[PDB]
Amino acid sequence: DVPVNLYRPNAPFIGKVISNEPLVKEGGIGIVQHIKFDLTGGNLKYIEGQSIGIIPPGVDKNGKPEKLRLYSIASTRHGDDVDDKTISLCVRQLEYKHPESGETVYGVCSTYLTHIEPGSEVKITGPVGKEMLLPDDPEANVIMLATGTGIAPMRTYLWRMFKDAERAANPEYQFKGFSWLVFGVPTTPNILYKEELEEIQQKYPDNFRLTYAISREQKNPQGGRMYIQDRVAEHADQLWQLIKNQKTHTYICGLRGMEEGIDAALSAAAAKEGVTWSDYQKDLKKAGRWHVETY
Numbered sequence: 502d503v504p505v506n507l508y509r510p511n512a513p514f515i516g517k518v519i520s521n522e523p524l525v526k527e528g529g530i531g532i533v534q535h536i537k538f539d540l541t542g543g544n545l546k547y548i549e550g551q552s553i554g555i556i557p558p559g560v561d562k563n564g565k566p567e568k569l570r571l572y573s574i575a576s577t578r579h580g581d582d583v584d585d586k587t588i589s590l591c592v593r594q595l596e597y598k599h600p601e602s603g604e605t606v607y608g609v610c611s612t613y614l615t616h617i618e619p620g621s622e623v624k625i626t627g628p629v630g631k632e633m634l635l636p637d638d639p640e641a642n643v644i645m646l647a648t649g650t651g652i653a654p655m656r657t658y659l660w661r662m663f664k665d666a667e668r669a670a671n672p673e674y675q676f677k678g679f680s681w682l683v684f685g686v687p688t689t690p691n692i693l694y695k696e697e698l699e700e701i702q703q704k705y706p707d708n709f710r711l712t713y714a715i716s717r718e719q720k721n722p723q724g725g726r727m728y729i730q731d732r733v734a735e736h737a738d739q740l741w742q743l744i745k746n747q748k749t750h751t752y753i754c755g756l757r758g759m760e761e762g763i764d765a766a767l768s769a770a771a772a773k774e775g776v777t778w779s780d781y782q783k784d785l786k787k788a789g790r791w792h793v794e795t796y
C-alpha cells in the first residue's frame with residue numbers, strides 16, 4: 502500500500518525547518534538548497550519517488566492565497582538521518598529576467614524556501630505520486646535520466662540502494678542489480694550531491710554507473726551544449742540493451758525537453774536491430790517500466 506495524501510491542502514501539516522544547506526559550490530550558477538524538515542508530531546509517512554506540497558505565505562497578483570507548489574522528496578522514507586524523523590527537499594531558486602522589462606523576477610515558493618530559516622514553520626502536504634516508484638525487485642536494472650533538481654527522486658532511490666545505514670535499516674531490500682544515472686547540470690559546481698554520488702560509485706562499482714552531462718564545460722560532437730540526450734545517444738546501444746530486459750526500469754525526471762532527444766537516440770539504436778522505438782516504448786509504458794516526471 503502506497504501512502505498518498507496523508508495531509509491535504511485544506512489542512513496542511515506544519516513542519517519546522519531543521520537545516521537549509523547550499524548545494525551549488527562556488528563558481529556555480531544560482532542557488533540550489535537541501536532543506537531538511539522535522540516530521541515528528543505528524544509522523545508523515547512517505548516512500549521514494551513521491552512528492553510533497555509546500556504552500557508558501559502571501560497572496561498573488563489577484564489577491565488570492567498562494568497555492569501549493571510540488572517538490573520531489575529528496576530523502577528516503579527514513580529521512581537523511583535514518584530515523585523516520587525528517588523529510589528533505591532539493592530546491593532550485595527560481596529567478597529570471599523579466600521578458601523585456603529585464604528586471605530580475607523571483608519565484609514565490611522557491612525563493613521562500615531557499616531563504617528559509619532553521620526553526621521556521623512550513624505548511625507541508627502529501628505525499629503524492631505513484632508513478633515514480635522503484636520496483637521491489639533487488640536485481641532490477643534502473644536507468645535514471647535526470648536534469649538539475651530532477652536528481653531528487655534519484656537520490657531517494659540511490660540512497661535506499663547503497664547507503665550503509667539504509668541497507669542496515671531495510672532487510673527486505675538489499676540491491677544487487679544495476680543502476681545507471683545520467684545526470685545533467687550546467688557546471689561542475691552545480692553537480693548536486695556530487696561527492697556522495699561518487700562515493701556510491703567507488704563503493705559499489707559493478708552496481709552503479711554515473712555519467713555526467715555538464716552543459717557548460719562540454720560540447721556534444723556537433724559543437725552544441727552537452728545535454729542528457731547527447732549522453733543517451735552516445736551510449737544509445739548500451740542503454741537500449743538494458744531497456745530490452747523486462748527487469749529494467751527507466752526514470753526520467755526534470756526538463757520535458759530531454760525526452761524527444763532521448764527518443765531520437767534510442768529510436769536509432771532500436772532501428773539498427775529492426776525495432777521501432779515509439780511502439781516499443783508504448784508497451785514499456787503500459788507495462789509500467791517507463792517512469793516520467795517532468796515539470
Ligand SMILES: Cc1cc2nc3c(=O)[nH]c(=O)nc-3n(C[C@H](O)[C@H](O)[C@H](O)COP(=O)(O)OP(=O)(O)OC[C@H]3O[C@@H](n4cnc5c(N)ncnc54)[C@H](O)[C@@H]3O)c2cc1C
Nearest residue numbers: 570571572573591592593595597608609610611650653796
Ligand atoms: C511533480 C513536480 C516536482 C517538482 N519537483 C521539484 C524539485 O524537486 N525541485 C524544484 O526546485 N522544483 C520542483 N518542481 C517545481 C516547483 O513546483 C515550482 O514550480 C518551482 O520551485 C517554481 O515555483 P515558485 O513558487 O518559485 O515560482 P512561481 O512563483 O510560480 O513562478 C513561476 C511562474 O513564473 C513565470 N515564469 C517562469 N519562468 C519564466 C521565464 N523564463 N520567463 C517568463 N516568465 C517565467 C511563469 O508564469 C511560471 O509559471 C516540481 C514541480 C512538479 C510539478
Ligand SMILES: NC(=O)c1ccc[n+]([C@@H]2O[C@H](COP(=O)([O-])OP(=O)(O)OC[C@H]3O[C@@H](n4cnc5c(N)ncnc54)[C@H](OP(=O)(O)O)[C@@H]3O)[C@@H](O)[C@H]2O)c1
Nearest residue numbers: 593595648649650651685686687716728755756758759796
Ligand atoms: N532541469 C529541470 O529540472 C528544470 C525543470 C523546470 C524548469 N527548469 C528551468 O531551469 C532552471 C534551473 O532549474 P534546475 O536546477 O532544475 O536545472 P539546471 O541546474 O538549470 O540544470 C538544467 C540543465 O538542463 C540543461 N538543458 C537546457 N535545455 C535543455 C534541453 N532542451 N534538453 C536537455 N537539457 C537541457 C541546461 O543546460 P544550459 O542551462 O546549460 O542550457 C542545464 O544544464 C529552473 O529554475 C527553470 O527556469 C529546469
